[PDB]
Amino acid sequence: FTTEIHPSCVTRQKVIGAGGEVYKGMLKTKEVPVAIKTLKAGYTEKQRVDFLGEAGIMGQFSHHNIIRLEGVISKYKPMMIITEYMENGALDKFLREKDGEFSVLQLVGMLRGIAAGMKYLANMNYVHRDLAARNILVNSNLVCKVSDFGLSRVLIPIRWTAPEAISYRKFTSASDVWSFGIVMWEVMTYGERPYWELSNHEVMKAINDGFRLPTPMDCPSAIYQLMMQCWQQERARRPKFADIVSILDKLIRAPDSLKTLADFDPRVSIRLP
Template sequence: MQPDAYNSRVPRSVGPKIPFVSTPKSRTYVDPHTYEDPNEAIREFAKEIDVSFITIEEVIGGGEFGDVCKGKFRIPAMNIEKDVAIKTLKPDGGDKARSDMLAEASIMGQFDDPNIVSLEGVVTRSNPIMIVTEYMRNGSLDKFLQQNDGMFTILQLIGMMRGVASGMVYLSHISFVHRDLAARNILVNENLVCKVSDFGLSRELEMDRSDYTTKGGKIPVRWTAPEAISYRKFTSASDVWSFGVVMWEILTYGERPYWNWSNQDVIKAVEEGFRLPPTMNYCPKILYQLMLDCWRVERSERPKFIEIVNRLDNLSRNPYLMEDGIALSAIDIDPDHYISPSDLLTVEEWLRSLNLERYTNVFISNGYTQVCHCLPLNHEHLLGLGIVSAVHRKKMLDSLRSPDGYIV
């Protein structure tokens, strides 16, 4: 969807609607992997669809099991036809791929929440096997933001965060841990409603335990809490950590967390206390504080998802609370910020004067072209740029302190 077309339906001046977050019925998620026969789980949790009711129109992507297509689902009893997304199993997928695909459908079939992608049903009695879900016109959140960089108000961005958090309230209430919460696994519909999807890495949170311990397997390091990386312990609290990273992705319009760092560099930095810095564009301090709360080392100190929803709702109703944000890219034209002549130096001139010109390309490639752009930086920001030498960071920050007392 083109940004102009989107904005004609969702005016930039209008804040997000705030729906009520309902508490799910008193029930607990059942892990389909506990069934000896995956077909039994499918029969219990998913509806079988006659393949004649499905029409595949076009391939829109590729998934773990096969193609992802857009199509139509005809419902004769209601005399309607709706757009759907269709995941198909590769002809040579094998028994394990079939079992995994049916397990994912059995997981989705247990969910019923407006911020979770809904399952329409499955096709298992003919080939290819299909999972049929609601169609989300704008695709994954990360790509949607990248394609519409800078197009939304802060209230609209908060509305996206709120939708994700609301879906996670539901999942946590039914004792389900996602394990792979990231912007790439959030889908967006034509009304900017964000819904949690992709449950391939998910596992249940057993009622008589406070955590779930995996036995190996891939972990999305950039989104994963330290205790989940170190000890393979996944809880709703580790999902909260991941949500903080999703907030950062939303505010950066889909930037890659920790940039081009290796996974080992990310793990080491986080263990040493590094956290993703405030985003380059407008980042209210109160939102960044919520991110930091999600990234607390002690998982018991992280907020619950219902608390996150309440805090985001409070910001939506009281946007003045975000007036302390700093637009880093506009600091050089802010009339309330004093700029000395030295601040108008280019970054190249400044670094050369410090004998640190080796970092010139690092700063320029990240949008810092003048010294005035660097005034809000602190040690965490510089470390985020890849300046690992504490001596060099101190030298840079000391040089940014003017006689008038900039606090950096």
């Protein structure tokens, strides 16, 4: 049972997104900021199962890097899912708005947090299917938390998705590891679009041909090596999230290890005599 919140305790203050709206608001239980997702009159049976299913999933979880469920409004209409407020919004937009503003150690710490959340989910037998920086939220302590929970409602996003999931719909924690590799590239590039302007068909062709994303600028060699191992075609060869967490924790605890950078391939020549 999730916590049932009375609507008098919830003050919607401003629209912060869509998913039928997501609000920033306050929750009285002194008041605390929350995110508030609503479900309007006329919702179908499937919408209700998906909506409360998302809450039911999140209520089973208790981890630092997983968005916390404060409670639900289900006895009154419109129904609401109330979650912890993440002041800095989605990670992809956050990185793009803060280009170059963080240390390599901060960026890798963000990835460690995401990986710890994903290790928790996988161990809990939850396959995310839509892991991407756009679905990771950032708070005012720079902590990154996996969000976007549900079933059929979360989705395919081709350039984040593992080949076996594209080709025959096999979604597992190992296809989430592939996605996590893409998220590593997103973070280290401050939110560049994976595969830039290649079309979805061109991306799948490139992957099948063996091509992989090139090294980000200023990227520790150990970090590029780890994301490349996330992108092994053979599922069984990919690291598990336990391995990823272990490696990232060891790199962070010996931070001089991150000063060794992978070579960056320039896509431009500048010659000055």
